[PDB]
Amino acid sequence: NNRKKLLLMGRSGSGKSSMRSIIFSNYSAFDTRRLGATIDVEHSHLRFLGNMTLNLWDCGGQDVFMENYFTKQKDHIFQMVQVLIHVFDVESTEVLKDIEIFAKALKQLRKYSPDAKIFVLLHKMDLVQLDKREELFQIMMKNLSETSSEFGFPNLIGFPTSIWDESLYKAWSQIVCSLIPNMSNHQSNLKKFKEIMNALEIILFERTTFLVICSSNLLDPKRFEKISNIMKNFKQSCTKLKSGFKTLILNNNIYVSELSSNMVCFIVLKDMNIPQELVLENIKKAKEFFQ
């Protein structure tokens, strides 16, 4: 297939529409307040990396809407599903029900799209106090894992998220990096890029969302998302100039350029003054291979 269908389900207020809005619609964190409850299933698509396209299914979670996806349209909904990003609101009271509904969804999937990938997000982790944020995740993932296991899907992946930090990008990067087929060639091409630039490391980002695609190297493990987040924050301050990001050089050491209408590269250079010119040239041959 060339198209991907993702299910963004969870109960109302889980904050899953804010997500989509920040990740594929250029919304700011606080910009999500005005969203308002989504009615039924709100559809969004996004051609991602040329050959691959995306079909995002944001399922308004008001109990009533929810009951209908599992009954009437369960075949419509759980039909041909690539991925399920189920979201739980860390501030929920109805946690046990929150989880039941999740099983309900797994039931409909274990049946209509059994090989779909399961992804869970403990959203709004910014409301929990730091000392607690970890064990609660551990505890929640523990339970969720067992439930997930009984409906077919054994090992699932978990991600603690908040629209107020970069933890949201890491999750969505890995999620989308699951639907990309051709990654062998990208790293391979990236690794070579690295050496011809003799850089400390090079990263690949999707021009539009600024999510990480791959890389090639102490250093911050969350550095990848923190880059996504910061550049996306720059993206949004550059609204008024109404022009897209082309390039940026930081201290003659870090170069960030667009390669094609799909990929952007980030190179931390290992030097301080390689003839800026001869470094850029190496950038222009790179476009050939990342279109």
């Binding site: 307040r33 005005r34 250093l219 550095r223 940026l248």
Partner: protein, 304 residues
């Protein structure tokens, strides 16, 4: 007590944000109080403690049952600027009313007073909303004061939020409008961008969002939002990999060609400019700025 240079007054109904605002501002004004007081201390008018001092006043729902007593008036005179906080969360017609009052009354006692009004808590609001919101408010006072007989009072309106960058961009202008003694720096900037392919220039202290100064250029394009964030990019991106041009600098160029340029000036004080080249390439457009800048840099180095 506070031996400050200016005396801003923050008035508004309870919970408008007048105390939260003081906290955010007093903090970001430190780099400046520092800078203009000793980093470079010249106007004999400067050996003071701090540049400004925000004295707040609580405003009762409606000013009918009451009007300002004398002690308030004696304050109005001491006050150089008057900042009115309109909580945008709720309705604001009777507030636009009490503003005409606070003006007329203040103005008789101390004209030449800066009257600044903040359309606050505008975080999480549609744009055409902020448009109407203001455009509507701006009119409702140009009528409320023509009724009060004083249409000549200059009123500057702002759109702010303390979870935003707005309150810093507003107060930046606000502080400048207040203290003229710190305009020699604005002037040095009107020179840097004078005769230039440079549109705007800000002087930001790495640890404050209230710019220290920028050009007199009228067409402020609210390029503040853009340059202000550029600093954070530079700092943040740099901070991750860290293990006449010997310092910190960052250059970025958009689709249409505009350039965001940042160059450190003096130990934590950076210059952020907007450079627009009609075709002229970057590499050399960049070098010609460096000239006017390196000059400007010396200028600050001379007075420091």
């Amino acid at each position: 007590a506070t031996d400050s240079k200016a005396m801003v007054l923050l008035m508004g109904v309870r919970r408008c944000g007048k105390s939260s605002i003081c906290k955010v501002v007093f903090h970001n004004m430190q780099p400046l109080d520092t800078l203009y007081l000793e980093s470079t201390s010249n106007p004999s008018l400067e050996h003071f403690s701090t540049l400004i001092d925000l004295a707040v006043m609580e405003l009762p729902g409606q000013l009918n049952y009451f009007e300002p007593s004398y002690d308030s008036e004696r304050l109005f005179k001491s006050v150089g600027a008057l900042v009115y906080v309109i909580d945008s969360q709720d309705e604001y017609i009777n507030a636009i009313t009490n503003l005409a009052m606070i003006i007329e009354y203040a103005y008789k006692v101390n004209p030449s007073i800066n009257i600044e009004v903040l359309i606050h808590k505008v975080d999480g609001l549609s744009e055409d909303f902020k448009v109407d919101a203001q455009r509507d408010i701006m009119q409702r006072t140009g009528e409320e004061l023509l009724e009060l007989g004083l249409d000549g009072v200059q009123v500057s309106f702002y759109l702010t939020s303390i979870f935003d960058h707005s309150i810093y961009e507003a107060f930046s202008r606000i502080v400048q409008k207040l203290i003229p003694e710190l305009s020699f720096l604005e002037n040095m900037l009107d020179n840097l961008i004078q005769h230039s392919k440079i549109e705007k220039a800000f002087l930001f202290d790495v640890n404050s969002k209230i710019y220290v100064s920028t050009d007199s250029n009228p067409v402020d394009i609210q390029m503040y939002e853009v340059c202000s964030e550029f600093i954070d990019v530079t700092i943040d991106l740099f901070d991750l990999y860290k293990a006449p041009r010997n310092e910190l600098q960052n250059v970025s160029q958009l689709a249409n060609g505009v350039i965001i340029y940042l160059r450190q000036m003096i130990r934590g004080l950076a210059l952020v400019a907007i450079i627009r080249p009609n075709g002229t390439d970057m590499e050399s457009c960049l070098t010609v700025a460096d000239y006017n800048i390196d000059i400007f840099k010396k200028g600050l180095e001379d007075i420091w």
